[PDB]
Amino acid sequence: XXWXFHXX
Amino acid sequence: XXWXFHXX
Amino acid sequence: XXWXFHXX
Amino acid sequence: XXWXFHXX
Amino acid sequence: HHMKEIDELTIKEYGVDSRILMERAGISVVLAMEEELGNLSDYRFLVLCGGGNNGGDGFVVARNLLGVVKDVLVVFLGKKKTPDCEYNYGLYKKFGGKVVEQFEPSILNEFDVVVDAIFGTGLRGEITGEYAEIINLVNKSGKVVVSVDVPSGIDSNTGKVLRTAVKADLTVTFGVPKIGHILFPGRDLTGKLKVANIGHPVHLINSINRYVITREMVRSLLPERPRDSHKGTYGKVLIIAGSRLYSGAPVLSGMGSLKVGTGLVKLAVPFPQNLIATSRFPELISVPIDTEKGFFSLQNLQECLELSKDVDVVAIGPGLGNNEHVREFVNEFLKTLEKPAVIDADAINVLDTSVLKERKSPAVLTPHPGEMARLVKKTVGDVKYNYELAEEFAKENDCVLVLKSATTIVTDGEKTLFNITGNTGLSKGGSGDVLTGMIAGFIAQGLSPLEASTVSVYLHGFAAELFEQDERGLTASELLRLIPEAIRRLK
Amino acid sequence: HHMKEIDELTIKEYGVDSRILMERAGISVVLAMEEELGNLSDYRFLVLCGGGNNGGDGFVVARNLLGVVKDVLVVFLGKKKTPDCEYNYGLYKKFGGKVVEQFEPSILNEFDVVVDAIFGTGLRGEITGEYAEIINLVNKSGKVVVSVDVPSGIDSNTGKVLRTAVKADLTVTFGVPKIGHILFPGRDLTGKLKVANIGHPVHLINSINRYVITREMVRSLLPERPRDSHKGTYGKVLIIAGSRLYSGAPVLSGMGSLKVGTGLVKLAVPFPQNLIATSRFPELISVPIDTEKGFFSLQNLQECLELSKDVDVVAIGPGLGNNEHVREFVNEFLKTLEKPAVIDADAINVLDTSVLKERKSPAVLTPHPGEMARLVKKTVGDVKYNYELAEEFAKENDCVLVLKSATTIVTDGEKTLFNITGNTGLSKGGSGDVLTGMIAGFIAQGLSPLEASTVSVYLHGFAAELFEQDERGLTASELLRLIPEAIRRLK
Amino acid sequence: HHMKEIDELTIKEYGVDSRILMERAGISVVLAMEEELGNLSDYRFLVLCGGGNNGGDGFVVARNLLGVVKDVLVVFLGKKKTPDCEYNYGLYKKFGGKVVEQFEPSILNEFDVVVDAIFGTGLRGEITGEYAEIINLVNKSGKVVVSVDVPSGIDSNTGKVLRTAVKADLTVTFGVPKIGHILFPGRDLTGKLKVANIGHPVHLINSINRYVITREMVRSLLPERPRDSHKGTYGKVLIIAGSRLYSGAPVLSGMGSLKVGTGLVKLAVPFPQNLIATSRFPELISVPIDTEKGFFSLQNLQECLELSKDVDVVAIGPGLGNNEHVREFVNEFLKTLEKPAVIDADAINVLDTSVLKERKSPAVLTPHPGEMARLVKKTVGDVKYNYELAEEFAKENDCVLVLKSATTIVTDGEKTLFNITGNTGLSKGGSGDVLTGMIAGFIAQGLSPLEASTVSVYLHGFAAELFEQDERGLTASELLRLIPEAIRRLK
Amino acid sequence: HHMKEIDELTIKEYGVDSRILMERAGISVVLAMEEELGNLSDYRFLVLCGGGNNGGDGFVVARNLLGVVKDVLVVFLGKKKTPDCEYNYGLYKKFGGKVVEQFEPSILNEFDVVVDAIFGTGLRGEITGEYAEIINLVNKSGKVVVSVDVPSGIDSNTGKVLRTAVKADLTVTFGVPKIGHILFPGRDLTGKLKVANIGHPVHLINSINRYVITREMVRSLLPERPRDSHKGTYGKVLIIAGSRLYSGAPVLSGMGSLKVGTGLVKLAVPFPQNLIATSRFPELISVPIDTEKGFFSLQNLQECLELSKDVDVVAIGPGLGNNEHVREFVNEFLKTLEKPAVIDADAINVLDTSVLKERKSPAVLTPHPGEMARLVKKTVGDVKYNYELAEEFAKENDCVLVLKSATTIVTDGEKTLFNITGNTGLSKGGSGDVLTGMIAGFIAQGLSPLEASTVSVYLHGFAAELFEQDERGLTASELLRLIPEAIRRLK
């Protein structure tokens, strides 16, 4: 689940 | 983890 | 193993 | 747990 | 006292821009959908917005899905827009969002999720016209429905359907659950409820004097089981119940008291029906009451008062019957009894409420709505889920009122709690008899009447939910068995 | 007879330097903490030492943690030091240990573990003053508390709190458990108890004539189940119980006898209340006793004596009621009965103790402390946990006294055992009725009254602990069900 | 081009109130901490705020923790406050938040988490004075440190430390990662990076022409493996490498091409050093080049050009040596070669950049920073992580520059990508030789030079991370083995 | 410097009664046996005691088993008793322990465990007579043997057997391991060694300047792998090795350097033998050295010195051969080389030690005992396990001496470490070549020569232990493979 945050 | 949402 | 300690 | 004994 | 007042204070007094509260509300809806649907990329969203701040929240949701999911369309249904809904409409369009103002029925087969931001809280009027047509179509659509704040068409203060309402799979409300999420039909239409924190001061959130009863609250009210204890530590209950016609009621109440940890439970039951109780559960004390014709009467007043002397709480009413001799007995008994009373079933049915006002000692009344209706001489429809009536009744009569239903209302006129544990297995004779004993049990162990009522309604229902097979096969005996697992599972 | 005498003999007669005993005691505290906390490297230890040998032990602990853990500080609270405490203070300082003599309250947030070596065994006087202030702070600190020997403030000979006492997570005592670890409140304040072997001759350790009842002792007392056996092999019990008011008591006692493996159990219960027993458990024999008014009386003496002829043990008292006719009956019966008697509940309440002295045959009395209080005409507070009173009562009356409480005292006046199995689920009517039958059961199978009482109290309690859900939901019927698993789990 | 411009457009052009963006930023920090720390209730938070919008974000965080965690304190370090930081300071205080303006060193032992909102992005100047003292204390504190946007003291445009910077366990930035999160030392100081969506139009987020290379991007660039394929489908590579001194370089490059799926790989290596390659990997074609003294020279120009005719890409440089004859050869060869060239190691060291500008055919140069430094006649410190220099070099010379380091910069002067896969196992001879072949391999299979460089740097590094034991034991041969698992794991 | 001195200080200076130290020692033996044998109840113990303090410890053990196990017997073998042994003999008898003074051979079939407390540390003289007869019988008995302090008959300062010694399954020593537990044969005779803390000040325990190399020590010496690193960060090694006869040595050394994380490894090997290295491992740089006849000579001095200029460490010796031309070369090279040198194998065999004293730069010599013997012109038996000789050699020659054997001695003349990792798989050509490169590798990465030697010997051996099949099948190539798992397993 990716609406709020992306990784690096 | 409970900052945003409470249950019922 | 019980040389040193007994329980209750 | 290491109070009493060290290894080798 | 309520949420529009809390919003207003948060804005006017605390100084949070209303647009911020609105952004947070909308964002919270997205995160809630994400956690219910998983990754939202592959979904197509139809957002239906009114001109109110509910619609405004919907525009926030729509804007926040823009560029991030397969499709977004807003059907704006309102005639005018509030300032904050206008601002967010404005931003949605600035961000390249498509809005239409016509709801063509076919439109919803082009989408997976319907976000219902049409009407919010404090909608007062019956929905008719095209709004109704639209809501009916959505409900026939078989799409996933997420409602903003409350499903549109539900009265947020009562849970009643205003002619027609959206049936949501998920509802994301803000600050606190609303009475309409908690009472039926509203509770059914809400689906899964998430309560988002959208930035109100925690003080204001706690300014609210109506509560859902939670596991944590009950855990914290549960009495102490100090190791150095004796039977005496855990209280003594008398239960006055049963009749030649209703012989099993006493057994269920008595066993209800024991299963919640009461030290000593005594029944007074007309002989030989008293023997039924110890045959089933020999831990119980079931005292034979010699009666003329199988029912308590004034002939038994003195014996029951004597039995009351050496106990902490008296429960009365389960299976007593309803005749004039029972009436006389129940009212003289309660008028004279200087002990907390838990008044159930047939005792409520013959109760003179004057007697209740005149009592120095506490009482808990546990009516189902037909009993309440007869007690206040109103229709069931008047009394069912009528929390204000129950408050005023409790306040007037200095009692705790536990008005039973799928959502149970517990109130002392000052504090009002809502129980939402349970299932339809409790819609069966015997259930209430169990609850009655549990309450008396918890009072006996030292909880106030309100505390005992809160804890008991919660567990009674949670115990029904722990039944291992189909709920509709649940019976009171099995419910008794499940009580100690419910208590374990609290902790 | 006790531990200070054992220490003294070990020193003066056996020749163990008292400093060696002390080193071992301290070392044993470290190893016990290590096994409860795991690796002690990362912990900071606040050791609180008095000037007695308890404090001396604390200095050994502190010295032995020096260099090995994150921090050690000793707050020395005493005014003077014993020789061995002086020696060990001396060594602690030689090894570079920091000592302060002022307890500043803030000090305990700089530490994880409080080692309480302030007061040891045979502290007689009420703790007031700054000692109290310090102990209260420690108890409010929320730190891990390890007590040396006994939590400071507990009377090691009675378990009573001397105004205030330390509440320990762990207590490490030496040689044997002390009466104050075993009786409440002391037993609660002790937390987890470890009994360290610090070098006393094993002979002296066994010179002690008071014992905790252990699994191993009970395993070894449990009667033999030889394959070539018949009903007759396992004894016959008569249980005289019940009344029109207390109909379920007989069922619980009778079933208690059966669940422990008794061959034949017979109840004499007033009719028709006798029928309650076989409806629940048809394995039982429940003989109808024709009574005038629902209670045993002298009219039933002859019938009960006849029934007694063909059994090994008679249990009497559960649910009989307390009136003069019951009194007459119980005392004439016991005066005349030439069989072991287990005397419970209402039979104790009407018991004339003269009758008990005059009996050639054995007896076991199973009072809870209110029954004991009435029996010896003392206050409950006088009799509760009063092992010396119970010994003297047993010795005077040639009986076995099982004085029930969270810790149960079993004594024949010569040997005194303490039971520590059980939980607050046993603080509920019916529990005692079960125990009564178990005892009679074990006597019937051939155990002496004391042996039967030891085994029974242990299992009754262990069975309560095996209940699968919350203890407070435990009832006697469920306890009966759990007895055979308790017996299995012994072995 | 960058984030302050994106914020500004989002505000001024799109119309999002800057306070909303700020609320979202702060909220996003809380949710990120919640997901790293779990339930935040039991934590005590020290929030350190500057007067900039970073500090403003910190006030949002602090306000949002108010009432919800064990403790919150803001130490406000600024002298003045921006409007939005003032607004949020205002709200924090309105909500009952404690602020102090003095940082007492002891303060941080009263807290578990330090939220660093002191300095944000575009901090230009070296931090000295008490700001430094404070940041050093925080870094010595051993507390959990969460940085807002960037760890304070890191130049967000370069990753350089401005005398001193916070070392964060977690950093939550907004919109996109910043160059200072990606380049060292900044990348080390950032700890775990979360990139929050705080509401910028997705268009603007994608207006950015610098990117971290992600799994998904590489998955999508990976060439097709159509079932009906032959060796020819997957390209032909020539690799000109090796010398009498550097015999193993050719083997690693050649094997690098094969492991990425190239159809045919041919090495031209001075004889007999060419035999080393087929002894290790007989799948390779290793052509003997007859040389005067063990090194390529102009004597070999013609043979290498002929070999170049029947291949798609030529890789040159690994292990060639650096003498004048090699120099002459490399430059005449590249001047004349009408094929894409991957230019590595010693070929870069002798490269005349004029030759590179004058080439019609593409090139990729794979310098480590010492090679780059010599190539542009700058210091390593000038060139290391100097993405602007690398862009301008690529733009000027019409090449793709892969400037290797723990973060590798791949640029064609228009698009600039950052690789963050890998570990220190790649800091070992042979590593670069592998990468060189992979690039040529991917070019041969049809990827553009930039695409081939992106994919290769990513996998080369990911392959190092898949090594099963300690990274420092990783060698190039093992890296080759791991390449196909890296490719599998892409998909 | 040693343990009898530590005991003495602990007694005379710190003030611990020697009887306390002795009680602790004995107790520690019981707890150690308990943890090796489990519950000791069912065992029969034959304790064999001398008249020294070792015997005294045995009496403590015996006394402490009294009453607690199936049987205890002490055979007291001494003629006289020390004061503390007398005291503990005294207590053993007081506690009812049986002592005999005659060892009848048959006696040991009546027992399961032999506790050997006959001779302790600092036994100097060869055991003959009946003591020998007794020890031989015990060793033939097949009983479980626990030795107190050291197995009787082992010289605690050398590990040599004094004609005959007990072979123990378990040995419990106090304070620290003794040289005789660590060196063979003593290390074999010790069996499982437990080192008990019997109360010596931790300062004194650390006053000891000889150490076993532990996992934790090596973990802490392991160099840092900072993310922002390049090849250059991890050092450069030159390895001068190989000859026409010994072509594989260079490959193993070179690969040893790489597997420990060295950035760049270069070999200088006579051509064409240099090609062998890059065929096996193309990551290596293997420089062809043109030689007259297959061996290094002074003709190569200049080239090797040039190669040495651009590296951090030079390793020399593996596979060079031993002729006069090699001798000349090695010594002129080392005389002139201003870089740390790791000197192995054939380089040691031709080494002029004068050259070694005269060097400004550091050196590590890695002799096996035959190489050491030739180097100092002593017999292997003189030099094997001769830690004092190795110290003095290191001190005299300003080098680190790694004297290889199953226990490896690493010393710089001031600090002496003992490595006990490894197995007989390392007793095979190639093993030493690997270690040589590892050391150079660790020096190159920045560890001091002593640190690099400590870490390397430990890992080299631990890597041999990680081999998955029978140790005797271990070869150097497989050992190389296992190095990175050994490093991982450190952490």
What does the model show?
Chains E, F, G, H: Residues 53-57, 120-126 are annotated as: NADPHX 1. Chains E, F, G, H: (6S)-NADPHX 1 binds at residues 131, 149. Chains E, F, G, H: Residues 3-206 are annotated as: NAD(P)H-hydrate epimerase. Chains E, F, G, H: Residues 3-206 form the YjeF N-terminal domain. The structure is cut from a larger assembly and holds four copies of chain A (8 residues) and four copies of chain E (491 residues). Chain A is mostly beta strands and 8 residues long. Chain A has no helices and one strand. The radius of gyration of chain A is 6 Å and the shape is elongated. In chain E, the strands form two sheets. A ten-stranded mixed β-sheet of chain E has the order 8-17-16-15-14-13-12-9-10-11, with helices on both faces. A seven-stranded parallel β-sheet of chain E has the order 3-2-1-4-5-6-7, covered by helices on one side. Chain E contains 21 helices and 17 strands. Chain E is elongated. Strand 1 of chain C pairs antiparallel with strand 7 (192-196) of chain F.
Class by SSE composition of chain A: mainly beta
Q: Can you identify the CATH superfamily of the largest domain in chain E?
A: Ribokinase
Largest sheet descriptor of chain E: 10 strands, mixed
Give the largest chain-chain interface (CB within 8 Å): E-F, 38 and 42 residues
SSE class of chain E: alpha/beta
The value of Rg of chain E in angstroms is: 26 Å
The helicity of chain A comes to: under 10%
Order of helices and strands of chain A: E
Oligomer: part of a larger assembly
Biggest pleated sheet of chain A: none
Gyration radius of chain A (Cα, Å) is 6 Å
CATH architecture of the largest domain in chain E: 3-Layer(aba) Sandwich
Give the tally of β-strands of chain E: 17
Order of strands, main sheet of chain E, comes to 8-17-16-15-14-13-12-9-10-11
Report the end-to-end length of chain A measured between terminal Cα atoms.
15 Å
Number of helices of chain E: 21
Shape of chain E: elongated
Strand portion of chain E: 15-25%
